[PDB]
Amino acid sequence: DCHGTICHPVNEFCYVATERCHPCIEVCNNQTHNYDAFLCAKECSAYK
C-alpha cells in the first residue's frame, strides 16, 4: 500500500489505484471532479 508510505490519518488516504496518498477532502466533497461516495465512506469518513 503506497509503497509503505503512511499518509496523514485524517487529511489523506492511501489510494491504491495510484499507490499514492490522496486528499480526503477531494473524494468527499461532492462539488469536486474526483468525488467518490464509496471511497469517501470507506477511506475517509470515520477519521474526521
Author numbering: 34 to 81
Which sentences did the original study use to describe this structure?
The Drosophila tumour necrosis factor (TNF) ligand-receptor system consists of a unique ligand, Eiger (Egr), and two receptors, Grindelwald (Grnd) and Wengen (Wgn), and therefore provides a simple system for exploring the interplay between ligand and receptors, and the requirement for Grnd and Wgn in TNF/Egr-mediated processes. Here, we report the crystallographic structure of the extracellular domain (ECD) of Grnd in complex with Egr, a high-affinity hetero-hexameric assembly reminiscent of human TNF:TNFR complexes. Here we show that trimeric Egr ligands assemble in hetero-hexamers with both Grnd and Wgn, with Grnd displaying nanomolar binding affinity for Egr, which is 3-orders of magnitude higher than that for Wgn. Altogether, our data provide insight into ligand-mediated activation of Grnd and suggest that distinct affinities of TNF ligands for their receptors promote different and non-redundant cellular functions.
To uncover the organizational principles of the Grnd:Egr interaction, we first determined the crystallographic structure of the extracellular portion of Grnd. Therefore, we further trimmed its boundaries by limited proteolysis with trypsin to a shorter fragment, which was assigned by mass spectrometry to Grnd30–81. The proteolytically defined Grnd30–81 readily yielded crystals diffracting to 0.92 Å resolution. The structure was solved by S-SAD, and refined to a Rfree of 0.16 and good stereochemistry. The final model includes residues 34–81 of Grnd, which we will refer to as Grnd-ECD hereon. The structure of Grnd-ECD consists of an N-terminal β-hairpin followed by two C-terminal antiparallel α-helices, with the 8 cysteines engaged in four disulfide bonds, with a topology that is reminiscent of the CRD fold seen in structurally known TNFRs. The C-terminus of the Grnd-CRD folds in a C2 helix-loop-helix module, organized in a nested pattern of disulfide bridges, according to the consensus sequence Cys57-x3-Cys61-x6-x5-Cys73-x3-Cys77 (where x is any given amino acids, and the subscript n indicates the number of residues). Although X2 and C2 modules are common features of TNFRs, Grnd-ECD is the first example of a TNFR fold combining the two together, with the side-chain of Phe46 fitting in between the two. A major finding of our structural characterization is that, in spite of the poor sequence homology, the ECD of Grnd adopts a cysteine-rich domain fold consisting of a X2 β-hairpin followed by a helical C2 module, in a combination that has not been observed in TNFR domains so far. The reciprocal orientation of the Grnd X2-C2 modules resembles that observed in single CRDs of human TNFRs such as TACI, BCMA and Fn14 and the fourth CRD of TNFR1, with the conserved Phe46Grnd side-chain packing between the two.
